[PDB]
Amino acid sequence: GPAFPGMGSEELRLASFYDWPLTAEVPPELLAAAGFFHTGHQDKVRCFFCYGGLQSWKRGDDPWTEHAKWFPGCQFLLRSKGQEYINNIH
Amino acid sequence: AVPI
Ligand SMILES: [Zn+2]
Numbered sequence: 001g002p003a004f005p006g007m008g009s010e011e012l013r014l015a016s017f018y019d020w021p022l023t024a025e026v027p028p029e030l031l032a033a034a035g036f037f038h039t040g041h042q043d044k045v046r047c048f049f050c051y052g053g054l055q056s057w058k059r060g061d062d063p064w065t066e067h068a069k070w071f072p073g074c075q076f077l078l079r080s081k082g083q084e085y086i087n088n089i090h
Numbered sequence: 091a092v093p094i
Contacts, residue, residue: 044094052093053093053094054091054092054093054094055091055092055093055094056091056092057091058091061091066091070091070092070093
């Protein structure tokens with residue numbers, strides 16, 4: 001099961017980005033869709049399922065791509081995007 | 091991005 005079941009709802013994850021510092025650069029809508037919530041500290045986000053944390057987001061970064069790059073064993077990522085998608089990033 |  002998920003590491004943090006309480007953030008399993010995409011709407012709750014989206015609400016967490018109310019003070020996100022990079023709205024133009026990396027859309028909260030995409031981050032929330034990809035399983036991430038904002039920790040509230042700088043640009044640090046975390047996946048509700050694997051609990052993997054990412055920071056130092058750059059212009060044009062794609063949340064799903066970064067999810068697969070750094071946490072390829074996440075079961076939320078696998079269920080959502082499939083194995084072909086993960087393998088292609090690696 | 092990079093891991094925390
Ligand atoms: Zn994950």
